[PDB]
Protein backbone atom coordinates (compact mmCIF):
# COMPACT_ATOMS: atom_id res chain seq x y z
CA UNK A 1 0.00 0.00 0.00
CA UNK A 2 1.58 3.22 -1.21
CA UNK A 3 0.45 6.40 0.56
CA UNK A 4 1.02 10.04 -0.26
CA UNK A 5 -0.37 12.88 1.78
CA UNK A 6 0.24 16.49 2.71
CA UNK A 7 -1.26 19.47 4.44
CA UNK A 8 -0.60 23.17 3.97
CA UNK A 9 -2.04 25.97 6.04
CA UNK A 10 0.45 28.51 4.79
CA UNK A 11 1.40 28.53 1.16
CA UNK A 12 7.97 26.21 -3.37
CA UNK A 13 6.11 22.93 -3.29
CA UNK A 14 3.91 24.32 -6.04
CA UNK A 15 4.30 24.82 -9.72
CA UNK A 16 2.69 28.05 -10.85
CA UNK A 17 1.42 28.93 -14.29
CA UNK A 18 0.06 32.19 -15.63
CA UNK A 19 -1.13 34.82 -13.18
CA UNK A 20 -0.97 32.21 -10.40
CA UNK A 21 0.80 33.71 -7.38
CA UNK A 22 1.24 33.32 -3.65
CA UNK A 23 1.33 36.28 -1.29
CA UNK A 24 0.22 36.77 2.31
CA UNK A 25 0.80 33.04 2.69
CA UNK A 26 -2.26 32.34 0.51
CA UNK A 27 -2.53 31.11 -3.06
CA UNK A 28 -3.99 33.83 -5.28
CA UNK A 29 -4.87 32.24 -8.70
CA UNK A 30 -6.14 35.31 -10.65
CA UNK A 31 -4.71 38.80 -11.00
CA UNK A 32 -5.31 41.57 -8.53
CA UNK A 33 -4.53 45.28 -8.98
CA UNK A 34 -2.66 47.49 -6.55
CA UNK A 35 -6.00 48.68 -5.21
CA UNK A 36 -6.79 45.02 -4.54
CA UNK A 37 -9.56 44.64 -7.12
CA UNK A 38 -9.77 41.64 -9.55
CA UNK A 39 -8.73 41.70 -13.23
CA UNK A 40 -10.44 40.99 -16.57
CA UNK A 41 -8.86 38.34 -18.88
CA UNK A 42 -6.88 36.49 -16.18
CA UNK A 43 -5.79 32.86 -15.83
CA UNK A 44 -3.71 30.99 -13.25
CA UNK A 45 -2.99 27.37 -12.35
CA UNK A 46 -1.13 25.96 -9.38
CA UNK A 47 0.09 22.38 -8.95
CA UNK A 48 1.77 20.22 -6.39
CA UNK A 49 5.47 19.62 -7.24
CA UNK A 50 5.38 15.89 -6.79
CA UNK A 51 3.14 13.92 -9.27
CA UNK A 52 0.81 11.35 -7.83
CA UNK A 53 -0.18 7.91 -9.17
CA UNK A 54 -3.92 7.30 -9.65
CA UNK A 55 -3.76 3.61 -10.55
CA UNK A 56 -1.44 0.81 -11.66
CA UNK A 57 -1.67 -0.66 -15.17
CA UNK A 58 -0.02 -3.91 -14.08
CA UNK A 59 -1.62 -4.63 -10.70
CA UNK A 60 -4.96 -3.24 -11.90
CA UNK A 61 -5.31 -1.62 -8.49
CA UNK A 62 -6.83 1.80 -8.27
CA UNK A 63 -6.22 4.31 -5.53
CA UNK A 64 -8.96 5.91 -3.50
CA UNK A 65 -8.08 9.46 -2.47
CA UNK A 66 -9.45 12.63 -0.89
CA UNK A 67 -8.73 16.36 -0.83
CA UNK A 68 -9.99 19.38 1.09
CA UNK A 69 -9.28 23.09 1.01
CA UNK A 70 -10.71 26.46 1.94
CA UNK A 71 -11.23 29.26 -0.57
CA UNK A 72 -12.67 32.85 -0.62
CA UNK A 73 -14.08 34.36 -3.79
CA UNK A 74 -14.96 38.08 -3.92
CA UNK A 75 -16.57 39.58 -6.97
CA UNK A 76 -17.57 43.21 -6.75
CA UNK A 77 -20.99 43.34 -8.43
CA UNK A 78 -21.96 39.79 -7.39
CA UNK A 79 -24.01 39.64 -10.58
CA UNK A 80 -20.85 40.12 -12.66
CA UNK A 81 -18.99 37.14 -11.26
CA UNK A 82 -16.78 35.08 -13.61
CA UNK A 83 -15.57 32.69 -14.49
CA UNK A 84 -14.98 30.43 -11.51
CA UNK A 85 -12.43 27.98 -10.13
CA UNK A 86 -11.70 24.27 -10.50
CA UNK A 87 -9.78 21.46 -8.86
CA UNK A 88 -8.10 19.27 -11.45
CA UNK A 89 -6.10 16.22 -12.35
CA UNK A 90 -4.14 16.80 -15.53
CA UNK A 91 -1.31 15.03 -17.38
CA UNK A 92 2.05 16.08 -15.92
CA UNK A 93 3.69 18.46 -18.40
CA UNK A 94 0.24 19.96 -19.10
CA UNK A 95 0.37 23.55 -20.38
CA UNK A 96 -2.73 25.64 -19.70
CA UNK A 97 -5.84 25.27 -21.90
CA UNK A 98 -8.57 27.76 -22.99
CA UNK A 99 -9.59 30.78 -20.82
CA UNK A 100 -13.25 26.87 -19.91
CA UNK A 101 -11.38 27.68 -16.73
CA UNK A 102 -7.97 26.94 -18.29
CA UNK A 103 -8.38 23.14 -18.27
CA UNK A 104 -10.57 22.28 -21.26
CA UNK A 105 -10.80 23.39 -24.88
CA UNK A 106 -14.40 22.41 -25.89
CA UNK A 107 -17.70 21.15 -24.52
CA UNK A 108 -17.19 17.96 -26.52
CA UNK A 109 -15.79 14.79 -24.95
CA UNK A 110 -12.19 14.34 -25.96
CA UNK A 111 -10.39 11.47 -24.24
CA UNK A 112 -7.14 12.98 -25.51
CA UNK A 113 -7.59 15.75 -22.93
CA UNK A 114 -6.99 13.17 -20.18
CA UNK A 115 -8.38 15.71 -17.71
CA UNK A 116 -10.93 15.47 -14.95
CA UNK A 117 -12.01 18.35 -12.75
CA UNK A 118 -14.47 19.64 -10.22
CA UNK A 119 -15.69 23.08 -11.24
CA UNK A 120 -17.21 25.83 -9.16
CA UNK A 121 -18.81 27.75 -12.02
CA UNK A 122 -19.89 31.32 -11.19
CA UNK A 123 -20.78 32.56 -14.74
CA UNK A 124 -23.38 30.60 -16.69
CA UNK A 125 -22.14 29.91 -20.22
CA UNK A 126 -25.40 29.32 -22.14
CA UNK A 127 -23.44 24.32 -21.98
CA UNK A 128 -23.83 25.58 -18.32
CA UNK A 129 -27.10 25.39 -16.27
CA UNK A 130 -28.96 28.60 -15.39
CA UNK A 131 -27.27 29.41 -12.04
CA UNK A 132 -23.96 29.05 -10.16
CA UNK A 133 -23.19 25.38 -9.79
CA UNK A 134 -20.75 22.70 -8.74
CA UNK A 135 -19.96 20.31 -11.58
CA UNK A 136 -18.00 17.15 -12.39
CA UNK A 137 -16.12 17.55 -15.65
CA UNK A 138 -14.74 14.57 -17.51
CA UNK A 139 -12.76 15.56 -20.58
CA UNK A 140 -15.17 18.40 -21.45
CA UNK A 141 -16.33 21.75 -19.97
CA UNK A 142 -19.80 20.17 -20.04
CA UNK A 143 -20.23 18.69 -16.56
CA UNK A 144 -21.68 15.19 -16.28
CA UNK A 145 -23.64 16.15 -13.10
CA UNK A 146 -24.16 19.55 -11.46
CA UNK A 147 -25.64 21.08 -8.31
CA UNK A 148 -27.08 24.48 -7.48
CA UNK A 149 -24.64 26.51 -5.43
CA UNK A 150 -25.51 29.52 -3.31
CA UNK A 151 -22.49 31.75 -3.60
CA UNK A 152 -21.48 33.69 -0.50
CA UNK A 153 -19.52 36.56 -2.03
CA UNK A 154 -16.40 37.37 0.01
CA UNK A 155 -17.04 34.54 2.46
CA UNK A 156 -15.04 31.39 2.75
CA UNK A 157 -15.91 28.05 1.26
CA UNK A 158 -14.71 24.86 2.84
CA UNK A 159 -14.82 22.16 0.15
CA UNK A 160 -14.21 18.39 0.19
CA UNK A 161 -13.69 16.06 -2.74
CA UNK A 162 -13.37 12.27 -2.48
CA UNK A 163 -13.02 9.35 -4.83
CA UNK A 164 -13.95 5.84 -3.68
CA UNK A 165 -12.21 3.37 -5.96
CA UNK A 166 -14.52 0.55 -4.80
CA UNK A 167 -17.64 2.27 -6.02
CA UNK A 168 -15.86 4.42 -8.64
CA UNK A 169 -17.94 7.19 -7.12
CA UNK A 170 -16.67 10.76 -7.00
CA UNK A 171 -18.21 13.17 -4.44
CA UNK A 172 -17.90 16.91 -3.77
CA UNK A 173 -19.25 19.44 -1.24
CA UNK A 174 -18.85 23.24 -0.67
CA UNK A 175 -19.88 24.61 2.71
CA UNK A 176 -20.16 28.25 3.76
CA UNK A 177 -19.95 28.36 7.55
CA UNK A 178 -20.75 32.08 7.57
CA UNK A 179 -24.22 31.06 6.38
CA UNK A 180 -24.44 27.40 7.47
CA UNK A 181 -25.12 26.42 3.83
CA UNK A 182 -24.15 23.05 2.30
CA UNK A 183 -24.04 21.33 -1.13
CA UNK A 184 -23.00 17.94 -2.68
CA UNK A 185 -22.74 16.29 -6.11
CA UNK A 186 -22.06 12.63 -6.80
CA UNK A 187 -21.18 10.72 -9.92
CA UNK A 188 -19.56 7.44 -11.00
CA UNK A 189 -16.33 8.04 -12.95
CA UNK A 190 -14.23 5.39 -14.67
CA UNK A 191 -10.98 7.00 -13.71
CA UNK A 192 -8.83 4.48 -15.63
CA UNK A 193 -10.30 5.56 -18.93
CA UNK A 194 -10.42 9.26 -18.31
CA UNK A 195 -6.87 9.80 -17.02
CA UNK A 196 -3.16 8.71 -17.07
CA UNK A 197 -1.41 6.48 -14.49
CA UNK A 198 0.32 9.57 -13.15
CA UNK A 199 -1.22 13.01 -12.97
CA UNK A 200 -0.70 16.43 -11.42
CA UNK A 201 -3.19 17.79 -8.91
CA UNK A 202 -4.01 21.41 -8.36
CA UNK A 203 -6.17 24.39 -9.15
CA UNK A 204 -7.05 26.55 -12.14
CA UNK A 205 -9.16 29.72 -12.23
CA UNK A 206 -10.08 32.29 -14.87
CA UNK A 207 -11.94 35.58 -15.18
CA UNK A 208 -14.17 37.11 -17.82
CA UNK A 209 -13.24 39.11 -20.89
CA UNK A 210 -15.87 41.90 -21.13
CA UNK A 211 -16.96 40.22 -15.10
CA UNK A 212 -14.31 39.12 -12.60
CA UNK A 213 -13.73 37.97 -9.08
CA UNK A 214 -10.86 36.83 -6.92
CA UNK A 215 -9.70 33.27 -6.62
CA UNK A 216 -7.70 32.70 -3.44
CA UNK A 217 -7.01 29.28 -1.92
CA UNK A 218 -6.40 29.48 1.82
CA UNK A 219 -5.44 25.95 2.87
CA UNK A 220 -4.96 22.63 1.07
CA UNK A 221 -4.83 19.02 2.20
CA UNK A 222 -4.46 15.80 0.27
CA UNK A 223 -4.17 12.00 0.62
CA UNK A 224 -4.11 9.02 -1.72
CA UNK A 225 -3.90 5.29 -0.95
CA UNK A 226 -2.90 2.83 -3.67
CA UNK A 227 -3.18 -0.93 -3.01
CA UNK A 228 -1.23 -3.93 -4.47
CA UNK B 1 -3.09 18.13 21.49
CA UNK B 2 -4.97 15.06 22.65
CA UNK B 3 -6.14 12.68 19.91
CA UNK B 4 -8.48 9.72 20.01
CA UNK B 5 -9.40 7.68 16.99
CA UNK B 6 -10.53 4.25 15.92
CA UNK B 7 -11.79 2.24 12.99
CA UNK B 8 -13.89 -0.91 12.90
CA UNK B 9 -14.79 -2.90 9.83
CA UNK B 10 -15.88 -5.93 11.80
CA UNK B 11 -17.85 -5.46 14.95
CA UNK B 12 -16.42 -5.99 23.13
CA UNK B 13 -15.39 -2.40 22.57
CA UNK B 14 -19.08 -1.52 22.63
CA UNK B 15 -21.63 -1.11 25.32
CA UNK B 16 -25.00 -2.47 24.24
CA UNK B 17 -28.41 -1.51 25.53
CA UNK B 18 -31.80 -2.96 24.76
CA UNK B 19 -32.23 -5.06 21.64
CA UNK B 20 -28.81 -3.87 20.45
CA UNK B 21 -26.80 -6.85 19.22
CA UNK B 22 -23.87 -7.82 17.04
CA UNK B 23 -23.94 -10.86 14.78
CA UNK B 24 -22.34 -11.63 11.43
CA UNK B 25 -19.68 -9.11 12.43
CA UNK B 26 -22.21 -6.28 12.00
CA UNK B 27 -24.02 -4.17 14.57
CA UNK B 28 -27.76 -4.90 14.48
CA UNK B 29 -29.56 -2.21 16.59
CA UNK B 30 -33.22 -3.41 16.35
CA UNK B 31 -34.75 -6.84 16.77
CA UNK B 32 -34.96 -9.38 13.99
CA UNK B 33 -37.00 -12.61 13.97
CA UNK B 34 -35.73 -16.05 13.06
CA UNK B 35 -37.11 -15.52 9.56
CA UNK B 36 -34.97 -12.40 9.41
CA UNK B 37 -37.80 -9.85 9.39
CA UNK B 38 -37.82 -6.71 11.63
CA UNK B 39 -39.82 -6.30 14.86
CA UNK B 40 -42.47 -3.87 16.17
CA UNK B 41 -41.75 -2.02 19.46
CA UNK B 42 -37.95 -2.39 19.38
CA UNK B 43 -35.12 -0.23 20.74
CA UNK B 44 -31.34 -0.60 20.83
CA UNK B 45 -28.34 1.61 21.55
CA UNK B 46 -24.66 0.87 21.10
CA UNK B 47 -21.75 2.91 22.48
CA UNK B 48 -18.00 2.98 22.37
CA UNK B 49 -16.45 1.66 25.63
CA UNK B 50 -14.09 4.53 26.14
CA UNK B 51 -15.69 8.00 26.77
CA UNK B 52 -14.39 10.91 24.79
CA UNK B 53 -13.81 14.53 25.83
CA UNK B 54 -15.57 17.20 23.76
CA UNK B 55 -14.00 20.26 25.34
CA UNK B 56 -12.04 21.51 28.36
CA UNK B 57 -13.67 23.77 30.96
CA UNK B 58 -10.30 25.13 32.10
CA UNK B 59 -8.39 25.64 28.84
CA UNK B 60 -11.58 26.71 27.06
CA UNK B 61 -10.40 24.68 24.09
CA UNK B 62 -12.92 22.75 22.09
CA UNK B 63 -12.22 19.68 20.04
CA UNK B 64 -13.08 19.36 16.38
CA UNK B 65 -14.00 15.79 15.44
CA UNK B 66 -15.40 13.60 12.67
CA UNK B 67 -17.13 10.25 12.24
CA UNK B 68 -18.17 8.02 9.35
CA UNK B 69 -19.98 4.73 9.02
CA UNK B 70 -21.97 2.61 6.61
CA UNK B 71 -25.48 1.38 7.33
CA UNK B 72 -28.25 -0.65 5.54
CA UNK B 73 -31.90 -0.19 6.40
CA UNK B 74 -34.52 -2.62 5.02
CA UNK B 75 -38.18 -2.06 5.67
CA UNK B 76 -40.58 -4.44 3.97
CA UNK B 77 -43.42 -2.20 2.77
CA UNK B 78 -41.18 0.86 2.22
CA UNK B 79 -44.20 2.97 3.05
CA UNK B 80 -44.35 1.44 6.55
CA UNK B 81 -40.83 2.38 7.55
CA UNK B 82 -40.17 3.44 11.16
CA UNK B 83 -38.82 4.91 13.17
CA UNK B 84 -35.26 5.54 12.05
CA UNK B 85 -31.72 5.68 13.40
CA UNK B 86 -29.51 8.31 15.04
CA UNK B 87 -25.90 9.02 15.88
CA UNK B 88 -25.58 10.55 19.32
CA UNK B 89 -23.50 12.11 22.04
CA UNK B 90 -25.01 11.46 25.43
CA UNK B 91 -23.88 11.81 29.06
CA UNK B 92 -21.90 8.73 30.11
CA UNK B 93 -24.12 6.64 32.38
CA UNK B 94 -27.10 7.54 30.15
CA UNK B 95 -29.92 5.00 30.28
CA UNK B 96 -32.15 4.86 27.20
CA UNK B 97 -34.89 7.47 26.68
CA UNK B 98 -38.34 7.30 24.98
CA UNK B 99 -39.11 4.88 22.07
CA UNK B 100 -38.03 9.72 19.84
CA UNK B 101 -35.47 7.17 18.75
CA UNK B 102 -34.45 6.33 22.34
CA UNK B 103 -32.48 9.54 22.93
CA UNK B 104 -35.04 12.25 23.70
CA UNK B 105 -38.20 12.51 25.78
CA UNK B 106 -40.04 15.53 24.24
CA UNK B 107 -39.99 17.96 21.32
CA UNK B 108 -39.27 20.74 23.80
CA UNK B 109 -35.75 22.05 24.42
CA UNK B 110 -34.45 20.70 27.69
CA UNK B 111 -30.80 21.50 28.40
CA UNK B 112 -30.95 18.88 31.16
CA UNK B 113 -31.01 16.23 28.42
CA UNK B 114 -27.42 17.17 27.53
CA UNK B 115 -27.88 15.25 24.29
CA UNK B 116 -27.12 16.07 20.70
CA UNK B 117 -27.81 13.79 17.76
CA UNK B 118 -28.02 13.42 14.03
CA UNK B 119 -31.25 11.65 13.08
CA UNK B 120 -32.15 9.74 9.97
CA UNK B 121 -35.91 9.89 10.40
CA UNK B 122 -37.91 7.44 8.25
CA UNK B 123 -41.41 7.94 9.80
CA UNK B 124 -42.85 11.45 9.83
CA UNK B 125 -44.23 12.29 13.27
CA UNK B 126 -46.74 15.07 12.50
CA UNK B 127 -42.85 17.90 14.90
CA UNK B 128 -41.30 16.11 11.81
CA UNK B 129 -41.39 17.48 8.20
CA UNK B 130 -43.52 15.73 5.57
CA UNK B 131 -40.93 13.25 4.23
CA UNK B 132 -37.88 11.18 5.29
CA UNK B 133 -35.18 13.55 6.41
CA UNK B 134 -31.78 14.04 7.99
CA UNK B 135 -31.95 16.27 11.04
CA UNK B 136 -29.76 17.92 13.69
CA UNK B 137 -31.26 17.47 17.14
CA UNK B 138 -30.14 19.58 20.06
CA UNK B 139 -31.81 18.57 23.31
CA UNK B 140 -35.16 17.89 21.59
CA UNK B 141 -36.63 15.47 18.99
CA UNK B 142 -37.45 18.63 17.02
CA UNK B 143 -34.49 19.07 14.67
CA UNK B 144 -33.00 22.56 14.31
CA UNK B 145 -32.36 22.00 10.55
CA UNK B 146 -33.45 19.15 8.27
CA UNK B 147 -32.93 17.88 4.72
CA UNK B 148 -35.00 15.76 2.37
CA UNK B 149 -33.60 12.25 2.14
CA UNK B 150 -34.31 9.77 -0.62
CA UNK B 151 -34.32 6.42 1.13
CA UNK B 152 -32.87 3.49 -0.78
CA UNK B 153 -34.58 0.57 0.95
CA UNK B 154 -32.18 -2.35 1.49
CA UNK B 155 -29.24 -0.43 0.02
CA UNK B 156 -26.30 0.87 1.93
CA UNK B 157 -25.81 4.39 3.15
CA UNK B 158 -22.37 5.82 3.62
CA UNK B 159 -22.69 8.75 6.04
CA UNK B 160 -20.22 11.37 7.31
CA UNK B 161 -20.62 13.74 10.24
CA UNK B 162 -18.14 16.48 11.17
CA UNK B 163 -17.88 19.24 13.71
CA UNK B 164 -15.56 22.20 13.11
CA UNK B 165 -14.84 23.83 16.45
CA UNK B 166 -13.58 27.00 14.72
CA UNK B 167 -16.86 27.69 13.04
CA UNK B 168 -18.98 25.74 15.56
CA UNK B 169 -20.55 24.28 12.43
CA UNK B 170 -21.88 20.73 12.38
CA UNK B 171 -22.28 18.97 8.99
CA UNK B 172 -23.81 15.67 7.88
CA UNK B 173 -24.19 13.71 4.60
CA UNK B 174 -25.78 10.34 3.60
CA UNK B 175 -24.79 8.88 0.24
CA UNK B 176 -26.29 5.87 -1.54
CA UNK B 177 -23.72 4.63 -4.04
CA UNK B 178 -26.21 2.12 -5.46
CA UNK B 179 -28.08 5.16 -6.78
CA UNK B 180 -25.39 7.87 -6.82
CA UNK B 181 -27.59 10.02 -4.55
CA UNK B 182 -26.23 12.57 -2.04
CA UNK B 183 -27.49 14.82 0.80
CA UNK B 184 -26.11 17.35 3.38
CA UNK B 185 -27.34 19.45 6.32
CA UNK B 186 -25.39 22.16 8.12
CA UNK B 187 -25.97 24.05 11.32
CA UNK B 188 -24.05 26.05 13.94
CA UNK B 189 -24.14 24.34 17.36
CA UNK B 190 -22.78 25.76 20.60
CA UNK B 191 -21.50 22.44 21.79
CA UNK B 192 -20.32 23.77 25.18
CA UNK B 193 -23.85 24.64 26.19
CA UNK B 194 -25.59 21.61 24.81
CA UNK B 195 -23.33 18.88 26.23
CA UNK B 196 -20.96 17.73 29.06
CA UNK B 197 -17.15 17.81 29.00
CA UNK B 198 -17.17 14.06 28.54
CA UNK B 199 -19.74 12.14 26.54
CA UNK B 200 -20.40 8.72 25.03
CA UNK B 201 -20.69 8.31 21.28
CA UNK B 202 -22.77 5.75 19.49
CA UNK B 203 -26.03 4.82 17.85
CA UNK B 204 -29.68 4.43 18.82
CA UNK B 205 -32.55 3.10 16.69
CA UNK B 206 -36.21 2.31 17.27
CA UNK B 207 -39.19 0.82 15.45
CA UNK B 208 -42.89 1.57 15.38
CA UNK B 209 -45.64 0.33 17.67
CA UNK B 210 -48.64 -0.36 15.38
CA UNK B 211 -44.18 -0.10 10.86
CA UNK B 212 -40.60 -1.38 11.21
CA UNK B 213 -37.32 -1.77 9.45
CA UNK B 214 -33.86 -3.04 10.18
CA UNK B 215 -31.08 -0.95 11.62
CA UNK B 216 -27.67 -2.48 10.92
CA UNK B 217 -24.37 -0.59 11.14
CA UNK B 218 -21.69 -2.10 8.94
CA UNK B 219 -18.53 -0.14 9.69
CA UNK B 220 -17.61 2.71 12.04
CA UNK B 221 -14.74 5.17 12.20
CA UNK B 222 -14.04 8.04 14.54
CA UNK B 223 -11.50 10.78 15.39
CA UNK B 224 -11.34 13.75 17.75
CA UNK B 225 -8.61 16.36 18.24
CA UNK B 226 -8.54 18.50 21.38
CA UNK B 227 -6.09 21.45 21.60
CA UNK B 228 -4.44 23.13 24.65
CA UNK B 229 -5.15 26.76 23.89
CA UNK B 230 -8.65 27.99 23.16
CA UNK B 231 -7.19 28.01 19.59
CA UNK B 232 -9.15 25.51 17.44
CA UNK B 233 -7.68 23.52 14.50
CA UNK B 234 -10.16 21.56 12.29
CA UNK B 235 -9.16 17.99 11.46
CA UNK B 236 -7.78 16.37 8.47
CA UNK B 237 -10.61 14.76 6.66
CA UNK B 238 -8.58 14.60 3.44
CA UNK B 239 -6.52 12.19 5.57
CA UNK B 240 -9.03 10.92 8.13
CA UNK B 241 -10.99 9.38 5.18
CA UNK B 242 -8.78 7.46 2.68
CA UNK B 243 -6.87 6.33 5.81
CA UNK B 244 -10.06 5.54 7.77
CA UNK B 245 -12.93 5.40 5.27
CA UNK B 246 -11.64 4.61 1.74
CA1 LIG C 1 -19.04 29.20 -16.75
CA1 LIG D 1 -40.04 10.16 13.39
MN1 LIG E 1 -20.40 24.49 -15.86
MN1 LIG F 1 -37.18 14.61 12.83
Swiss-Prot record, chain A:
<dbReference type="InterPro" id="IPR001220">
    <property type="entry name" value="Legume_lectin_dom"/>
</dbReference>
<dbReference type="InterPro" id="IPR013320">
    <property type="entry name" value="ConA-like_dom_sf"/>
</dbReference>
<comment type="function">
    <text>Metalloglycoprotein, containing Ca, Mg, Mn, and Zn and the carbohydrates galactose, glucosamine, mannose, and fucose. It agglutinates erythrocytes of blood group A1.</text>
</comment>
<keyword id="KW-0430">Lectin</keyword>
<dbReference type="InterPro" id="IPR016363">
    <property type="entry name" value="L-lectin"/>
</dbReference>
<keyword id="KW-0465">Mannose-binding</keyword>
<dbReference type="InterPro" id="IPR019825">
    <property type="entry name" value="Lectin_legB_Mn/Ca_BS"/>
</dbReference>
<protein>
    <recommendedName>
        <fullName>Lectin DB58</fullName>
    </recommendedName>
</protein>
<dbReference type="Pfam" id="PF00139">
    <property type="entry name" value="Lectin_legB"/>
</dbReference>
<feature type="glycosylation site" description="N-linked (GlcNAc...) asparagine">
    <location>
        <position position="77"/>
    </location>
</feature>
<keyword id="KW-0106">Calcium</keyword>
<dbReference type="InterPro" id="IPR000985">
    <property type="entry name" value="Lectin_LegA_CS"/>
</dbReference>
<comment type="subunit">
    <text>Heterodimer, composed of an alpha and a beta subunit derived from a single precursor.</text>
</comment>
<keyword id="KW-0732">Signal</keyword>
<comment type="similarity">
    <text>Belongs to the leguminous lectin family.</text>
</comment>
<keyword id="KW-0325">Glycoprotein</keyword>
<dbReference type="InterPro" id="IPR050258">
    <property type="entry name" value="Leguminous_Lectin"/>
</dbReference>
<dbReference type="GO" id="GO:0005537">
    <property type="term" value="F:D-mannose binding"/>
</dbReference>
